[PDB]
Every structure is written in C-alpha cells, then in structure tokens.
C-alpha cells in the first residue's frame, strides 16, 4: 500500500469519456450525429441568435423596458456594507472590544472587494446582542441603535467627508440658523 507511478488511477466517475460523434452507428451518434435530418439546426456554422423566435416579434422586444433603466436614470447601488447583530454575536468579540470596520476584516466576517473597500459601514438590527461593545460606524438603523443602547453598548458615529459648499450657500443656510436662534430666544 505505497504509491508509485503505476498503482495510481482516477476515482470512479471522475473523468467520464467523451462522445466522439460521427463514428459508427452502434457506438453513439453516428451518421447525422443526433442532429436529425436537415435544415438550419443541422447545418454547420453559427446558429441563430439566442433570443430570436422565427421572426415573430421576440419576447424581449415585445415587453417594455424596466422602470428607471429605460430612460438613463442611474441604477441603484449599495452605499454601505450592511451588518446585522447576528454576525457580531457569532464572532469572538469579548467585552470592551472595538468593532469598527477594520476589526471586521481582521476576523474576516466581511471580505470587501473594490467597490466595497471604498465604502462606509452601517449596522442593521437582527438577533439580540449580549455583551458590551464599543461600536464605530458611519450609520445605524433605528432598531439597531435602539437595541444597542438597550444592551449598554457605546455607539460612536464617525463623521462623513464634508461636502464642499460655496460661501453664498453657507450664508443662506446660516441665515436660517440665525432665524431659528433669534426666534427660540
């Protein structure tokens, strides 16, 4: 029971031998090869387009384009990496531990790709967390931070990158705040 070049061999079923069409009848698909008699599908060469029915107006053409796509309204895209509390429970987090983004790559429960890399993090309530954790994320759902502050966890909300605003719009938006402030006081 030692291996050498000669006692080797594959597993039953692993490599199944291929049909060689056009050899013999008794074999397999001989003569016609399983293309039956004639006409377009038995002829050599590129077929007819996959989505095409005989010249009847094809299914895809007789149905109207999907809502937003149809005009060039940009498609909807995920803007956060959603995490539930389930995952944070299953993970090995001991008390006091910082969650953040980085420490979720550390334990691997999130593997970010390019688009996902460039993203922030958001927390979605599901499952019931038992521990006291220090959490950092750009956003939370309502049920999320409700369950978190119910369990005694500190919720650090990270600042998003400032939107540049020209000065005139700061003057407007501030004039507002001055109005509110002079009114309540």
């Amino acid at each position: 029971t030692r291996f050498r070049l000669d006692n080797l061999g594959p597993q039953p079923g692993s490599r199944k031998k291929g049909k060689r069409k056009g050899r013999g009848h008794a074999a397999g698909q001989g003569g016609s090869c399983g293309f039956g008699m004639r006409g377009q599908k038995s002829r050599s060469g590129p077929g007819i387009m996959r989505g095409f029915e005989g010249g009847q107006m094809p299914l895809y053409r007789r149905i109207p384009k999907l809502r937003g796509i149809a005009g060039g309204m940009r498609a909807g895209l995920p803007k956060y990496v959603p995490i539930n509390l389930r995952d944070i429970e299953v993970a090995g987090f001991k008390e006091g531990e910082e969650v953040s983004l980085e420490s979720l790559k550390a334990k691997g429960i999130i593997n970010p790709s390019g688009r996902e890399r460039r993203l922030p993090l958001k927390i979605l309530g599901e499952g019931e967390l038992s521990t006291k954790l220090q959490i950092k994320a750009r956003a939370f759902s309502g049920s999320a931070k409700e369950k978190l502050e119910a369990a005694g966890c500190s919720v650090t909300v990270l600042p998003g990158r400032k939107k540049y605003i020209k000065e005139s719009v700061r003057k407007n938006l501030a004039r507002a705040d001055e109005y509110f402030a002079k009114k309540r006081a």
């Binding site: 996959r50 989505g51 029915e53 094809p58 299914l59 895809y60 053409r61 007789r62 149905i63 109207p64 384009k65 999907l66 809502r67 796509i69 149809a70």
Partner: protein, 72 residues
C-alpha cells in the same frame, strides 16, 4: 485576453431578478390608448409578473451574468 460572453443588453433592460432569484418583467401595453382601457385593466397592466417558465431558456441564454435560481 480570451473572449468572454457578452450580456445581451436589450434583454437586460427588460428582465431582472428578485432577491430569491426568480426572473421578472413588466406587462405590455400601458403606454398609449389608455383612455379606452378600463381602470381595472390598467391596474392589472401596472404590476410585475414572474416570466413564464417556457421562455426561461431564451432569456437565461442571453443574460449569462444574471444570477438566477431555477429552484433545484
């Protein structure tokens, strides 16, 4: 640089997929000539319908990158 399959684009502006993996489409005919179609009919033509099992082939064949479960 080999060749990779191309998504048939005119098929992908039409069909899409739901989270559980079934294909859906709009219904035909709510565009013009609505006045003479009753409201009830108009509502029926407003919703999203799962594509008939029959066509699943053609569709699937022309949208190779659509993630789809045929429920196996």
């Amino acid at each position: 640089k080999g060749y990779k399959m191309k998504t048939h684009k005119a098929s992908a502006k039409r069909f899409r997929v739901t989270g559980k993996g079934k294909i859906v489409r709009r219904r035909a005919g709510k565009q013009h000539l609505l006045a003479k179609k009753n409201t009830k009919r108009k509502n029926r033509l407003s919703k999203l319908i799962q594509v008939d099992r029959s066509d699943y082939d053609n569709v699937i064949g022309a949208l190779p990158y659509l993630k789809v479960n045929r429920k196996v």
